[PDB]
Design a protein that fits this description.
virus, elongated, mainly alpha, 6 chains, part of a larger assembly
Chain lengths: 231, 231, 231, 231, 231, 77
């Protein structure tokens, strides 16, 4: 990344082995889950194109997924130059030029230019432009083996309600939809078939008390709910 | 390393034994493989010849790989040397000697010289030249440490297409083939070495199918393969 | 050690406790071996003759071999006076005093003198001369050892032509072998026990070829699922 | 501990956890090997009398040995007090009062009076004088802890001599014998207690035969490369 | 925490998560013990009341002995109020307000106010005073919970004299008895509670024998005299 | 040769093969140390403990008398 410095000018640093290891733990295991997009955000806060390609490349796992991302963003890269002047500004390495799509994604730019673009004030946001293409590329792999349907979000009869929530957000962030279809279906079927003790205390409290008493309810559910609560 | 390479005054920093112990750990976990090479690059952004000689000599094991790499960087230096004339040194303070191919590899040069050439503005880049040479020798081990080969890889008779096409892509990463060859390879060769059950669906899927549309063929058939995976 | 060596603005700081914990168990557990040598070089950046002398006193394993290492160091430290006698150049330029063999081995020099030598620009480089002498004695000490079971690494008749070859260089890496002895051990161990088809290919190549060539052979010779790929 | 300063007088910094960790490991693993003296002193660089005291309160086992060591310090602080008479009447205004034995022990004296003594002219080594009390006490604990006498160290008939030499030099570390006596032990107990065949060679080589020559005794016995083979 | 040395302005440093973690992890291994204390001193270097509070507040285990410890802090806070007149404003014109029991415990005062008394001439060590109250707290904890004591303990059937002396001293640290009592226990009761055969030979080392003379004697009688050791 | 073997055809095979190569003199000495000595019979290696590195050839060719074999086929006709 680019990292602010105490006494002077901003410094470029290479992405650390801890950071590529922390990322490797995430992506190879969360690949088909919507969960990866904000981890990606957080572990790419200062990131240059070169940092971004380094983060793509150091993954071992899901190599054909990894290509479907690389191919996806080169289409964005081609797309960009359709409306935006090609080779505008200075021809030569080491000057302030206006980046093409394949400059954005660090394919045709050298790192020195990237450093110039990201040290400018306000910064020239090449890596932010590229991260949005990688999020869109990430949406496509997340979709590929994920479920999508509103009737396919599962709800067991004795669960203490939380497991349904924890499935809900990792289902409906795969594909965009209507807020009203997400709300109305919550009400007519999903919550209406949930744990009948849970519904009782919760919808007696209503939209007028905090979820605490509902969440303090439904103790002792199988083996895992019998597990210690005071430790 | 020499740090702060593309930003004003660059300066030297020592390679840490934990950075070295962590390098060797990738090598323990992935053997000699493609996926090593970017971890090598990430830890090689600022590297002097001496950092590079410190990186190969700390490996210890895999000594047939080390010996092959070692002749390839020597064969590369020899070639620099018979192509670019190098004569007798400075006779006065404030003067700089020419690199040899041996100097660039850190055979005959001392670190202080390496610092002078690579901290000059603009630098005389001995670390670049050699790190590339080392990468050539790393790729060349990949050929002689390859699991299977692109023609030999194939789909088991009840094997999911999804498992197959990932390991196929792992396989094509070790392959050094051109891009037009890589294009055919990921289309025809892939479909051909498919099993008879998926091959049909794959022939029906036909010309001009994208990787998005590859990865979604043979879904939802059930049976063996599906234990942890939602249909 | 000095902190900020080669970086100006230098301070002397005390030796780190995790560097000492890593040191004592490395010399204890693994012995005077080829891996010690490049780690000792990486481990001991910025160290003074007090720090390196503090580090030879803290080594608690291999005592007898250490007394031949101490004799060896006391020999170079003596010989340096025989090789480079103090101030036999011009008295006029410069103003430090020229160090004896035993101001380098930290035996007569005070820590202020060593600080001044290593805080000059360019410096008088006491630490690194000391680190060479210890490396040189690490090589003499290594040669005091020879692995049993060099000659028991015999090529497995149906196995690929890799790990036995690998092991044979590894066992013989500090054994100092001759061209004809290396070719003879190659035939004896490797060629004469390998696979029938391979043995014909290897006798046809001859045991005197470089490693990229020996590695190339025997791969894709065999028929359907018999092509001898690395396991 | 004590830390260096580039303008004006020295300053003190917080004690490190990992220093106490390094010290507790080298105390614990072998329960007080002669490894404690170079190691304690490696971690007692710049260590005030209150830091040396913190190092003594780190040892949680061995509370006999630890109080024996405190009563040893108690006799040493006395030794100091007897050697030097206590100032009668008022101390002269200005610079530090001379240190009394328990003040050196860090019990009756504060941190800042230690800073005072070390910045003073001449320097008063309050850290270094108390540190010698500890190390004498640590050798008392190692002497108590030692398994056998250097005059009873001896080996079975087919054990290597070279392994005995090493057992000898491990043995020597805790032994404060005069050097003539130690040279005499080197050339008598090793030479006398070597196996019949090493007696045959050490006679042939003679009285002036080296320690390297001692370790290379019983060499040449086997077949090539430590293996006999029939033609 | 606070550091004053080599800073240009006197403000707070934020507490490390690995500080708190390392403190909790110390309590895991040892419990409230003598053992936590030297690791508490290092992990509470520069500690202000607020930091001290945070370090108390994350302990989740041992919660009766937390209640005894806090009670004991409150108690020396009550003591201090009736100790000397606390000045509610400045003690003299040009000097800070005095700290009473709620100011030392961190309840009425704010972090910069606490930085004030540590950075002030003269300094008032509010956080060390509270650490002492913490040290007194812990000293009551180990004594209520102490499983046996000095006039009930005796040397075992097969217990070495040394490990008896060690096990007495460990008891006698936890036992918070009056000092002339403890001085009678280390002189007379220690001798009296040994093995009886043992006790007769400590009768035989002449009047008032020293701990080193005692430690170097008592041989053959009671528990094991020989100890196997790793060199 | 095997380790207990009487230390005569091996010495013919060594010298004849040396005479075949026509090896350089210095290399013959390194070959002797490398090969001849490290293959020698036990009693022949007692001479290299008794004499150390300064070992003469006549001593070694006068060793190994307690085993059989043909010797040098010395006779008086």
């Amino acid at each position: 990344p680019i990292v602010q410095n105490l006494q002077g000018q901003m410094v470029h640093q290479a992405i650390s082995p801890r950071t590529l290891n922390a990322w490797v733990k995430v992506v190879e295991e969360k690949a088909f889950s919507p969960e990866v997009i904000p981890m990606f955000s957080a572990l790419s806060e200062g990131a240059t194109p070169q940092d971004l390609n380094t983060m793509l490349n150091t993954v071992g796992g899901h190599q054909a997924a990894m290509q479907m991302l690389k191919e996806t963003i080169n289409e964005e890269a081609a797309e960009w130059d359709r409306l935006h002047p090609v080779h505008a500004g200075p021809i030569e390495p080491g000057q302030m030029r206006e980046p093409r799509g394949s400059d954005i994604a660090g394919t045709t730019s050298t790192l020195q230019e990237q450093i110039g673009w990201m040290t400018h004030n306000p910064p020239i946001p090449v890596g932010e432009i590229y991260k949005r293409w990688i999020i869109l590329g990430l949406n496509k792999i997340v979709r590929m083996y994920s479920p999508t349907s509103i009737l396919d979000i599962r709800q067991g009869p004795k669960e203490p309600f939380r497991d349904y929530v924890d499935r809900f957000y990792k289902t409906l962030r795969a594909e965009q939809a209507s807020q009203e279809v997400k709300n109305w279906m919550t009400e007519t079927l999903l919550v209406q078939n949930a744990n009948p003790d849970c519904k009782t205390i919760l919808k007696a409290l209503g939209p007028a008390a905090t979820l605490e008493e509902m969440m303090t309810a439904c103790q002792g559910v199988g083996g895992p709910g019998h597990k210690a609560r005071v430790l």
